[PDB]
Amino acid sequence: MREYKVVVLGSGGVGKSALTVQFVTGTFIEKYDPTIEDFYRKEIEVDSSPSVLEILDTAGTEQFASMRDLYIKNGQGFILVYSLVNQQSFQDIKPMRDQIIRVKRYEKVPVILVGNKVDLESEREVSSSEGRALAEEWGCPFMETSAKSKTMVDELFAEIVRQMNYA
Ligand SMILES: Nc1nc2c(ncn2[C@@H]2O[C@H](COP(=O)(O)OP(=O)(O)O)[C@@H](O)[C@H]2O)c(=O)[nH]1
Ligand SMILES: [Mg+2]
Ligand SMILES: [Mg+2]
Numbered sequence: 001m002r003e004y005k006v007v008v009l010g011s012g013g014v015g016k017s018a019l020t021v022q023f024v025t026g027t028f029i030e031k032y033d034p035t036i037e038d039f040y041r042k043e044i045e046v047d048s049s050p051s052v053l054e055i056l057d058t059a060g061t062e063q064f065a066s067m068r069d070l071y072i073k074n075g076q077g078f079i080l081v082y083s084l085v086n087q088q089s090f091q092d093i094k095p096m097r098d099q100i101i102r103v104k105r106y107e108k109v110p111v112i113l114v115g116n117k118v119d120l121e122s123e124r125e126v127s128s129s130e131g132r133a134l135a136e137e138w139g140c141p142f143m144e145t146s147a148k149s150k151t152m153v154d155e156l157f158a159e160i161v162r163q164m165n166y167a
Contacts, residue, residue, distance in 0.1 A: 003052045004164050006157070007075035009068075011092045012061030014083040015116040018147035020057045023157050028148045034061045046158040053157060068096070072103045077110040077164040079156065084115040084144060087125040097138060110163035111140045114156060119146035 008016045012034045021029050024040050038057045043050060058071055072078075080097055082089040093113070100109055113135040115126060128144060135142035141159055145152045 001052045003054055004161055005054050005056070005074070005076045006079060006160055006164075007056045007058060007071050007077075008079045008081060009058060009071070009093075009096055010060055010081035010114075011083075011086075011089040014060075014081045014086070014089050015145075015147045016060060016079075016081050017057055019079075019081065019114075019116065019145065019153055019156070020055055022147045022150060022153040023055070026150050035059045044154075044157055044161065046161045051161050053161070055157075065099075068099060069103055072100050077112075077160045079112055079114060079160055081114045081116050082126065082131075083117045084126045084131070085117050085120045085123040090115070090126045090130070094134070108167045110160065110167045111138065112156065112160055112163060113138065113140055113142050115142075115144045116147060118144045119148050 008020055010016050017032045018029050020040060024042050037059050040055045040057065042053050042055065044053055056071065056075065078100060080093050082093045097111065113131060115131045132142045141163065143156060145156060147153065
């Protein structure tokens with residue numbers, strides 16, 4: 001079975017857990033402790049070929065540099081999530097990506113940048129153009145999501161599979 005190990009990263013409260021649980025269960029959650037780590041296995045077809053994803057949902061809030069290193073070493077593809085209604089979470093995702101490239105120095109690293117919470121667009125603090133500009137500097141896909149939408153979340157997880165195969 002081709003298995004892909006995906007790790008979801010980003011500051012506390014951006015929606016890592018809500019995106020993952022939308023993907024797994026098709027439902028949107030209202031809150032969940034930031035100190036929990038959870039693994040999920042889930043089959044997906046991407047471009048009509050069945051794949052198995054193991055997704056690691058991280059306790060991401062200010063966690064110690066060596067603990068982010070451990071997650072990076074053992075993941076194969078990374079979803080980097082910020083909240084478009086929280087510009088500090090956008091500033092925070094830059095160091096996270098650069099740490100991945102350094103830690104994984106002998107590899108091309110499949111990554112996607114996600115600006116989440118697009119359903120709250122009247123509280124938007126980060127423009128689409130600013131996220132797109134950063135993803136263009138990183139040479140990776142960019143998407144704005146809401147964890148309320150199962151189609152957006154399915155498209156996200158399909159595209160990380162495609163990135164992991166192209167690398
Ligand atoms: N409106 C809205 N709320 C969201 C969205 N994604 C997550 N949330 C809410 O934001 C809070 C934090 O989300 P959570 O997934 O726990 O964040 P994490 O700490 O990154 O895992 C919870 O109240 C979620 O319901 C989204 O796309 N839209
Ligand atoms: Mg969480
Ligand atoms: Mg658990």
